[PDB]
CSV table of C-alpha atoms and ligand atoms in Angstrom, one decimal:
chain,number,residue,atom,x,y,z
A,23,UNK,CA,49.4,-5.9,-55.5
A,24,UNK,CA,47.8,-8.9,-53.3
A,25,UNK,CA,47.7,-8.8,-49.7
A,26,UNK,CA,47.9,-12.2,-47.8
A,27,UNK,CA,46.5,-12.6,-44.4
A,28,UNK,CA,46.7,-16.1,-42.1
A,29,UNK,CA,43.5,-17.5,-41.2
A,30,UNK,CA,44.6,-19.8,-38.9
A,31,UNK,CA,45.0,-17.9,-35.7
A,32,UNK,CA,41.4,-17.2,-36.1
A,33,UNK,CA,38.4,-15.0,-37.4
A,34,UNK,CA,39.8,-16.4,-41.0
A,35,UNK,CA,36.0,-17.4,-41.8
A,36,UNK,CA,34.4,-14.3,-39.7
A,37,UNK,CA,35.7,-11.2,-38.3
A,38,UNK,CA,39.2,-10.9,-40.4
A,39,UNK,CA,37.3,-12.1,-43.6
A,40,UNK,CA,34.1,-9.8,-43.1
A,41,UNK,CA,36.5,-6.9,-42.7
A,42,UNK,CA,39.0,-7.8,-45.6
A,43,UNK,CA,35.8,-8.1,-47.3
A,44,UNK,CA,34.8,-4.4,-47.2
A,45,UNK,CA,38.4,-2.7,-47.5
A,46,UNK,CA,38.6,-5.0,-50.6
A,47,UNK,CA,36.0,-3.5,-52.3
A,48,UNK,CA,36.2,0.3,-51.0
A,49,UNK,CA,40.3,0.4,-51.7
A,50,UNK,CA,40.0,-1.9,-55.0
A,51,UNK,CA,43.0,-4.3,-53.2
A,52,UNK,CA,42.9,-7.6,-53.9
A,53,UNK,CA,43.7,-10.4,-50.8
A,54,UNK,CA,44.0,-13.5,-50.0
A,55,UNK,CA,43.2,-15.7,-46.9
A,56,UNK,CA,45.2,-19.0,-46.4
A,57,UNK,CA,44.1,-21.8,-43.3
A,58,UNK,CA,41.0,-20.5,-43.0
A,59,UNK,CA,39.6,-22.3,-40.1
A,60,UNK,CA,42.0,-24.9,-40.2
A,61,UNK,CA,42.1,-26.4,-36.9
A,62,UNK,CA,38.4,-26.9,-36.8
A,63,UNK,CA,36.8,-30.3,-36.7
A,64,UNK,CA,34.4,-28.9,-39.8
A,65,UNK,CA,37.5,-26.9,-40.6
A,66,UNK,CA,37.6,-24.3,-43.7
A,67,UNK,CA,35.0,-22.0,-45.1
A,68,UNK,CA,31.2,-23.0,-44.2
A,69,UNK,CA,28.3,-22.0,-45.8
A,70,UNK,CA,27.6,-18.8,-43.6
A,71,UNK,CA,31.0,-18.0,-44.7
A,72,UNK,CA,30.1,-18.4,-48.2
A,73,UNK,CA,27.4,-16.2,-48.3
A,74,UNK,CA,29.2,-13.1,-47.2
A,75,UNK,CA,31.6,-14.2,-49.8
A,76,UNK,CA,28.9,-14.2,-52.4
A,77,UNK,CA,27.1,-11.1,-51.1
A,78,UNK,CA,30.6,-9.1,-51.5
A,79,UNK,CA,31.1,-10.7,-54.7
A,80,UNK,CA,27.2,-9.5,-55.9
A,81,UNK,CA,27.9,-5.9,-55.0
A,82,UNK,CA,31.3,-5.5,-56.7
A,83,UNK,CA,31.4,-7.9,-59.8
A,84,UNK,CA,34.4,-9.5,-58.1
A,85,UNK,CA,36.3,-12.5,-59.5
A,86,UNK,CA,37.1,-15.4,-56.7
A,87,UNK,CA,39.1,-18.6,-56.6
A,88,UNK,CA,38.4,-21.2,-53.5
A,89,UNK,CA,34.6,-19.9,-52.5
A,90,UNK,CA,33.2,-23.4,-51.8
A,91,UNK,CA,32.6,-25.3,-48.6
A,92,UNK,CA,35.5,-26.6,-46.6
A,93,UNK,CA,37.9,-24.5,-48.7
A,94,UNK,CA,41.1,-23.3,-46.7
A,95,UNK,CA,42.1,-20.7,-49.4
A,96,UNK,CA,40.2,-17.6,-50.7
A,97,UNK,CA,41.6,-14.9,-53.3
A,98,UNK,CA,39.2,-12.3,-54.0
A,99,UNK,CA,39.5,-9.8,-56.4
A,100,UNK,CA,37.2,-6.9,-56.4
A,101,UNK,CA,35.4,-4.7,-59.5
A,102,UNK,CA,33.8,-1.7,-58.8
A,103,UNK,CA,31.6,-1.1,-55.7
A,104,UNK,CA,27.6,-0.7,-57.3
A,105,UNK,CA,24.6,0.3,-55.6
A,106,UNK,CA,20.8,-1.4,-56.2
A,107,UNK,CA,18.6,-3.8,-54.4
A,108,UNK,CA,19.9,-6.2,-52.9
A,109,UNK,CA,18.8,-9.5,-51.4
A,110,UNK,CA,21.0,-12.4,-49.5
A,111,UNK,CA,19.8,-15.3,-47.5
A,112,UNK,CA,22.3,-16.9,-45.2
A,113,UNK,CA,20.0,-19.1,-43.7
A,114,UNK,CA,19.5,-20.6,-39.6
A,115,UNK,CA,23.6,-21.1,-39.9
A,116,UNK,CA,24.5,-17.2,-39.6
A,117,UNK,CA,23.4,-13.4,-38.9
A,118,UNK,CA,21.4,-11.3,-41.0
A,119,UNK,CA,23.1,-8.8,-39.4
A,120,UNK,CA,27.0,-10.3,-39.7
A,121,UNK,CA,25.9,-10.4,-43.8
A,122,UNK,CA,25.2,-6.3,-43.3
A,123,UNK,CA,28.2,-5.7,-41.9
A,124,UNK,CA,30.3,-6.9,-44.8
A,125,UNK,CA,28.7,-5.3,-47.3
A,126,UNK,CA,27.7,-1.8,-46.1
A,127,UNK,CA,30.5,-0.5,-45.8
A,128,UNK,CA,31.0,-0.9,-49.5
A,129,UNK,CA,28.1,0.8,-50.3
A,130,UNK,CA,28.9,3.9,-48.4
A,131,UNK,CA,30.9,4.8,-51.7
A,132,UNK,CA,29.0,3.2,-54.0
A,133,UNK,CA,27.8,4.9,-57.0
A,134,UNK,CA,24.0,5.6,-55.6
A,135,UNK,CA,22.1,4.3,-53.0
A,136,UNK,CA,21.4,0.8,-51.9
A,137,UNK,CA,18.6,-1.5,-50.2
A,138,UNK,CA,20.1,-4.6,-48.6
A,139,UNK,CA,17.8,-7.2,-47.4
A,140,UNK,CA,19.5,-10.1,-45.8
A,141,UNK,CA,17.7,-13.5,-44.2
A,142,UNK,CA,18.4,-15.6,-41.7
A,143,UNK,CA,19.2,-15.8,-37.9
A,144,UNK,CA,18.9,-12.4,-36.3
A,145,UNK,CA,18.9,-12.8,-32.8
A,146,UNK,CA,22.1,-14.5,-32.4
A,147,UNK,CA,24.5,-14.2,-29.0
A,148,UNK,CA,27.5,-13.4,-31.4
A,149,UNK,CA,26.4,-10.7,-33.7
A,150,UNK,CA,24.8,-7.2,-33.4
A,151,UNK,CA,21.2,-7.3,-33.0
A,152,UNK,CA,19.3,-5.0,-35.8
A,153,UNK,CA,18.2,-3.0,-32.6
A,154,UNK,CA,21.8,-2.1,-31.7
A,155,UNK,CA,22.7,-1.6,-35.0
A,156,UNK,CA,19.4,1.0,-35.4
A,157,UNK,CA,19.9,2.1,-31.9
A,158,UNK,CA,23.9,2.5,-31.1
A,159,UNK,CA,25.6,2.4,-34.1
A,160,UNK,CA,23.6,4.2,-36.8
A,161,UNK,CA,23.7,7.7,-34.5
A,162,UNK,CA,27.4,7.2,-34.3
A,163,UNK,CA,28.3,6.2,-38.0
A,164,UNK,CA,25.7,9.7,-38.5
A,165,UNK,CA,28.2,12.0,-36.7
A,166,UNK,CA,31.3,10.6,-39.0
A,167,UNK,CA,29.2,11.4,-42.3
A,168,UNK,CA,28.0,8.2,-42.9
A,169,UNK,CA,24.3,7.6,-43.4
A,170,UNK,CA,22.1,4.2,-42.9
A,171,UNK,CA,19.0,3.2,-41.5
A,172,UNK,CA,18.5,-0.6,-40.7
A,173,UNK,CA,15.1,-1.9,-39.7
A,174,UNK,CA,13.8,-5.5,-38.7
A,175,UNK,CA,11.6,-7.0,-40.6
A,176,UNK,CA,10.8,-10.5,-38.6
A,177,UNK,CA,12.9,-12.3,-36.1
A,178,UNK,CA,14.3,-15.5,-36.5
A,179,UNK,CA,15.4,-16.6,-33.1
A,180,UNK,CA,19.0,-18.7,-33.1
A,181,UNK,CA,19.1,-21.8,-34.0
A,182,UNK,CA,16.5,-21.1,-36.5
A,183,UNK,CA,16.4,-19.1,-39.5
A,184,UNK,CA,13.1,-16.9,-41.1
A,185,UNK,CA,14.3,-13.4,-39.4
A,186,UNK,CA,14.7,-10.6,-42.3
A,187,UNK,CA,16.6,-7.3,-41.6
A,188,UNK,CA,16.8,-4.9,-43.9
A,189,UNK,CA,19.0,-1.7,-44.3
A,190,UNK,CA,18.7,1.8,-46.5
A,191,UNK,CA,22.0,3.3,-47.2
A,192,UNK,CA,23.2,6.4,-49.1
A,193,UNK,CA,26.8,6.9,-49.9
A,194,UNK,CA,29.1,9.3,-48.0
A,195,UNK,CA,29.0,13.2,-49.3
A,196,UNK,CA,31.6,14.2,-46.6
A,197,UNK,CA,33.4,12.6,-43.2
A,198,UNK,CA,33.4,14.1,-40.4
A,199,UNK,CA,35.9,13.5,-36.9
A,200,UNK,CA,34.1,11.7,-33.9
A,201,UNK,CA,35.9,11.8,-31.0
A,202,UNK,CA,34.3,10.1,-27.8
A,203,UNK,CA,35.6,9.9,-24.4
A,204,UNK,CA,33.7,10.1,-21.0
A,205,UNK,CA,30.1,8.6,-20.4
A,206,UNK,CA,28.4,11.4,-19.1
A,207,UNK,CA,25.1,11.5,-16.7
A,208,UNK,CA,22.8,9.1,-17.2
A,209,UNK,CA,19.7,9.5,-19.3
A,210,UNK,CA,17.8,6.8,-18.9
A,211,UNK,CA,17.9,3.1,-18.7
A,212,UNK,CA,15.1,1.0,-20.4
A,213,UNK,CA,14.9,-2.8,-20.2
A,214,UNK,CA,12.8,-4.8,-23.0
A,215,UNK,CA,12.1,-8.5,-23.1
A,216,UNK,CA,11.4,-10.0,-26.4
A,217,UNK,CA,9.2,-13.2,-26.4
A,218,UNK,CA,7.9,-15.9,-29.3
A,219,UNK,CA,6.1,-18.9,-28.3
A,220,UNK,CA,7.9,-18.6,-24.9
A,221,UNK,CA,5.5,-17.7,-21.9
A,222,UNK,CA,4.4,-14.6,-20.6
A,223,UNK,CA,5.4,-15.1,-16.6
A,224,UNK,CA,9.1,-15.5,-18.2
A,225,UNK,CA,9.4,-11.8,-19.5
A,226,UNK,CA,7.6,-10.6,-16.0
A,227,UNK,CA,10.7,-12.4,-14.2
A,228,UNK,CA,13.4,-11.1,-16.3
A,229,UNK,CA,11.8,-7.0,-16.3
A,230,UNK,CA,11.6,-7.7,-12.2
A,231,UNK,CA,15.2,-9.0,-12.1
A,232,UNK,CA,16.8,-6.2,-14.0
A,233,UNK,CA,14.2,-3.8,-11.6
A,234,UNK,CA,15.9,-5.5,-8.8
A,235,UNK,CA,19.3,-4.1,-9.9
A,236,UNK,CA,18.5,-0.7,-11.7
A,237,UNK,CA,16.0,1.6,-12.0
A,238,UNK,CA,14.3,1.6,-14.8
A,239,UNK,CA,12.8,4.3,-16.5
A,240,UNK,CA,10.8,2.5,-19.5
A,241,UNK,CA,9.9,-1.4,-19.4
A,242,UNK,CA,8.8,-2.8,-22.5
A,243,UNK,CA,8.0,-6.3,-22.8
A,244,UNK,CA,6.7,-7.5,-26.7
A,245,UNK,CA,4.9,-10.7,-27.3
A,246,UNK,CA,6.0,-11.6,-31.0
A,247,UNK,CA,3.6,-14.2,-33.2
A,248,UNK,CA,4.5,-18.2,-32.5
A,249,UNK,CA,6.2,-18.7,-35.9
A,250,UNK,CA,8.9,-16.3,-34.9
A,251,UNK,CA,10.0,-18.5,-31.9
A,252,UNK,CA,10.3,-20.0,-30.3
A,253,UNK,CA,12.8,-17.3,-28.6
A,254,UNK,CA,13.3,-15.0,-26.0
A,255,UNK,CA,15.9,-11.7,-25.7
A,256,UNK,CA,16.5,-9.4,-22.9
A,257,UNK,CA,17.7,-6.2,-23.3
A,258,UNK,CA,18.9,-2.9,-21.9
A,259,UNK,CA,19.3,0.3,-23.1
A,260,UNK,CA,21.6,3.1,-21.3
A,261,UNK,CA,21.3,6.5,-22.7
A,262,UNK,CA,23.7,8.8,-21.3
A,263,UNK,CA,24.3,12.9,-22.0
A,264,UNK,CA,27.4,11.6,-24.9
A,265,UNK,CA,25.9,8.3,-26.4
A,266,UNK,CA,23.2,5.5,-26.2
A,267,UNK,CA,24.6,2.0,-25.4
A,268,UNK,CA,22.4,-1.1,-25.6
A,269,UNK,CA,23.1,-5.1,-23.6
A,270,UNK,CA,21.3,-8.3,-24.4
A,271,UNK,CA,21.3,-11.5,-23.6
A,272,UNK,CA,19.4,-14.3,-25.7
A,273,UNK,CA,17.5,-16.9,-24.0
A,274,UNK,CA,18.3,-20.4,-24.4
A,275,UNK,CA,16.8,-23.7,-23.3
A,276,UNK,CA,17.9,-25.0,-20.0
A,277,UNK,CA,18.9,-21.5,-18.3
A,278,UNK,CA,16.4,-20.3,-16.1
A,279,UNK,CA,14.5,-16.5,-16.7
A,280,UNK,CA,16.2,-15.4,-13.4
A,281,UNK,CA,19.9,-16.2,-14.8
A,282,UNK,CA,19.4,-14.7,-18.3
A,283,UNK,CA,18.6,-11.8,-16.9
A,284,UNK,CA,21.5,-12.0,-14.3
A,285,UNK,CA,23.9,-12.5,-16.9
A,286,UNK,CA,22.7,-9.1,-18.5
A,287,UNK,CA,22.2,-7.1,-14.6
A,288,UNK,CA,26.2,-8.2,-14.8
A,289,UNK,CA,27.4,-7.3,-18.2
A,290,UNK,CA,25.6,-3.8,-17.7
A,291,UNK,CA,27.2,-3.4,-14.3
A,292,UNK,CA,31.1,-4.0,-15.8
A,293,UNK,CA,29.6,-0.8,-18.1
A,294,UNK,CA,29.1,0.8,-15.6
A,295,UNK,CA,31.7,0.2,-14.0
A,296,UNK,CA,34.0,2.4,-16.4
A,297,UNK,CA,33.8,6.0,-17.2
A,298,UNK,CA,33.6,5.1,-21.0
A,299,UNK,CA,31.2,5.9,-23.3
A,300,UNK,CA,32.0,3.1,-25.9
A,301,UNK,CA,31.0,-0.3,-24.5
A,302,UNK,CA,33.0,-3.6,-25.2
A,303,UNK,CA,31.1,-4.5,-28.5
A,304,UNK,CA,30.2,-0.9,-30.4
A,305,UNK,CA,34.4,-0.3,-29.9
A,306,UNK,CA,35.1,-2.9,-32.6
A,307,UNK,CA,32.4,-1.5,-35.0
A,308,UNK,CA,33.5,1.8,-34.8
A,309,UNK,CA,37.2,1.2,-36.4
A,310,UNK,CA,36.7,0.7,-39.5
A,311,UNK,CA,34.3,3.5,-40.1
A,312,UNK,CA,36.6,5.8,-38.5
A,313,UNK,CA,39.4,4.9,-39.9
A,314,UNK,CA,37.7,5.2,-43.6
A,315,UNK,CA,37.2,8.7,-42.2
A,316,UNK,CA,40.8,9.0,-41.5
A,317,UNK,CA,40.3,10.4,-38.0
A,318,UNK,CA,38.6,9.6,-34.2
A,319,UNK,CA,39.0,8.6,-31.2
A,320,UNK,CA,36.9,7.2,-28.4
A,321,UNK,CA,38.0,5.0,-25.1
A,322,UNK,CA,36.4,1.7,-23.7
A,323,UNK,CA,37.4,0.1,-20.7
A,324,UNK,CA,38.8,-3.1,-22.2
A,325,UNK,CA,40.0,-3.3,-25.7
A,326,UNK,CA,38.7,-6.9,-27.1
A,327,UNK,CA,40.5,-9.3,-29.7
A,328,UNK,CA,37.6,-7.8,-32.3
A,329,UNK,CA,38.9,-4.8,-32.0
A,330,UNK,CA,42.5,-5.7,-32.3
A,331,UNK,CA,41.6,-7.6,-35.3
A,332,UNK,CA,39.8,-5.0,-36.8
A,333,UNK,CA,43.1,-2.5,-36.1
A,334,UNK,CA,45.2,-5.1,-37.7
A,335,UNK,CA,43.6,-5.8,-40.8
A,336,UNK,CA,42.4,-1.9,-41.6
A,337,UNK,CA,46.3,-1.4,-41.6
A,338,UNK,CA,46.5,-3.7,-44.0
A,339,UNK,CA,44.4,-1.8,-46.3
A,340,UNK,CA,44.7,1.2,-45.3
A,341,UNK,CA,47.6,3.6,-44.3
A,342,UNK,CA,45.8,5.0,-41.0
A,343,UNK,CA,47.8,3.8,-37.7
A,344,UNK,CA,45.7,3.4,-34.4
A,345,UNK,CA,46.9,4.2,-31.5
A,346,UNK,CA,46.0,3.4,-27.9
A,347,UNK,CA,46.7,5.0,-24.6
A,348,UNK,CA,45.8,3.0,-21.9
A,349,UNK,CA,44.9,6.2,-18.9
A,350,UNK,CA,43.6,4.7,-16.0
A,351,UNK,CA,41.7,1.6,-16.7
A,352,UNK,CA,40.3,2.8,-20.0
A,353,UNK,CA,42.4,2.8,-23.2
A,354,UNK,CA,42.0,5.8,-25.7
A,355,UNK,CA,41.7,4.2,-29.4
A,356,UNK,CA,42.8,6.9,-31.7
A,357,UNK,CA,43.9,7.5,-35.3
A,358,UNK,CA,47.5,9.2,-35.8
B,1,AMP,P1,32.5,-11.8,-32.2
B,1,AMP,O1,32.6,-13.0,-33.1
B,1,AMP,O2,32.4,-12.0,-30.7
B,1,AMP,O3,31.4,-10.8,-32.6
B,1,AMP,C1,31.3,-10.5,-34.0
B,1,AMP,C2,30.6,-9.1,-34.3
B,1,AMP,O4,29.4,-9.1,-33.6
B,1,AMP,C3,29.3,-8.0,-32.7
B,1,AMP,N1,28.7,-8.4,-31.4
B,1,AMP,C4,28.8,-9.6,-30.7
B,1,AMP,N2,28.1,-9.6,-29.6
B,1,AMP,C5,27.5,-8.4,-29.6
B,1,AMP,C6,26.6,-7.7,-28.6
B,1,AMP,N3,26.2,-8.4,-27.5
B,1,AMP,N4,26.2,-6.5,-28.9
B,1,AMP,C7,26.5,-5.8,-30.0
B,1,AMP,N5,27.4,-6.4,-30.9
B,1,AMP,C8,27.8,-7.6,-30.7
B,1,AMP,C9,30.8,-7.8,-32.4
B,1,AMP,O5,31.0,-6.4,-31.8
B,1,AMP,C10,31.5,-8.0,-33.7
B,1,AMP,O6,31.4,-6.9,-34.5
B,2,NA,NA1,33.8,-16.9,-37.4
């Protein structure tokens, strides 16, 4: 019939509406979202909104009332799911990556495969960088059945737009049950620093000030061309006996090399910290994949409103039920 979700209490423009989005298109169930963004002082949906709207809308034949800026109300009512080539440009004002993650999971049961190319901003603090998207999730969503290979083309370093990601996709022969639990040993732990236009003696502070906290196995530090930046990215990547997990932090003007990289020494430490495999971030991406599976499990040490969000609206959609099982200081996400 037509499901109604609030968009008021948040996420109405962003995490509900990218995951409505997708379950739209794969179950063929019309929605609508009402107060989108209403108590914001540019309140309803922007134009970074809009473009996921349109990108869903380009890969289904949809039919929409209330796509335009500032609008509180969307209804969106999705055609059939097709695959091609796709392009999208969303511009300085969102995420290449935010634009991928509406629309893939669509085209895992599309009628043939599919090339998205989306640009825009692609090293953003509030999205998945292409890296953990190639690096993280893509081994994961692999294991469940579902096959995609993302590459960057050029960064665009938040604020500014010009970064290009692109992704391959095939749709899904068969699922396949995931279940993730403990960490495991340690592989290894590699730390990257990502620079445009930004000087060299910054990316030799932040490799040393990760070094001064773990020991790292690979150190890779990549001098991008001027026009990219300017921007700057630290990263780490923890690869462990039952998954790889990845931590950034993006650079911004007036914070020092030495407290970037701090921030990133602390965020990998609360990893750490747990026994979990699934860090903070990957634990939201992995629900609605699982879910379309109709099985899996994995725990994280503290469940996030993204994931809750992503729980709430898949049930919606869907008639999985998630459960959680919070066993000391980690909660076990699983579907009935
Ligand atoms: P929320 O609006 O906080 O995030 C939206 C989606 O972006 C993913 N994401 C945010 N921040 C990160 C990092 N640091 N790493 C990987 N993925 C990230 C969230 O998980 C949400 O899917
Ligand atoms: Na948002």
């Amino acid at each position: 019939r037509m499901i109604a979700l609030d968009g008021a209490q948040g996420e109405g423009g962003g995490q509900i509406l990218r995951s409505a989005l997708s379950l739209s298109m794969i179950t063929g169930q019309p929605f609508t979202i009402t107060s989108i963004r209403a108590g914001r002082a540019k309140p309803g949906l922007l134009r970074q909104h809009l473009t996921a709207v349109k990108a869903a809308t380009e890969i289904c034949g949809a039919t929409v009332e209330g796509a335009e800026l500032g609008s509180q109300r969307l209804l969106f009512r999705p055609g059939t799911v097709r695959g091609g080539d796709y392009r999208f440009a969303i511009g300085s004002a969102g995420s290449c990556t935010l634009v991928l993650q509406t629309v893939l999971p669509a085209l895992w049961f599309a009628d043939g495969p599919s090339r998205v190319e989306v640009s825009g901003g692609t090293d953003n603090p509030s999205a998945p960088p292409a890296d953990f998207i190639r690096r993280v999730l893509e081994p994961l969503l692999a294991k469940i059945g579902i096959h995609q290979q993302t590459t960057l083309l050029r960064h665009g370093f938040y604020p500014a737009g010009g970064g290009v990601v692109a992704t391959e996709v095939s749709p899904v022969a068969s699922f396949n049950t995931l279940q993730l639990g403990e960490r495991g040993n340690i592989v290894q732990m590699r730390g990257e620093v990502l620079l445009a236009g930004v000087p060299r003696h910054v990316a030799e502070r932040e490799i040393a000030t990760l070094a001064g906290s773990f020991s790292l196995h690979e150190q890779n530090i990549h001098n991008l061309p001027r026009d990219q930046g300017p921007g700057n990215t630290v990263s780490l990547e923890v690869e462990s006996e039952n998954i790889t997990e990845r931590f950034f932090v993006v650079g911004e003007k007036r914070v020092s090399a030495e407290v970037v990289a701090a921030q990133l020494v602390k965020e990998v430490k609360r990893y750490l910290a747990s026994t979990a495999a699934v860090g903070e971030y990957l634990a939201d991406q992995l629900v609605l994949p699982m879910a379309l599976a109709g099985a899996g499990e994995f725990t994280v040490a503290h469940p996030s409103c993204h994931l809750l969000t992503n729980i709430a609206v898949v049930e919606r959609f869907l008639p999985v039920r998630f459960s959680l099982i919070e066993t000391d200081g980690v909660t076990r996400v699983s579907i009935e």
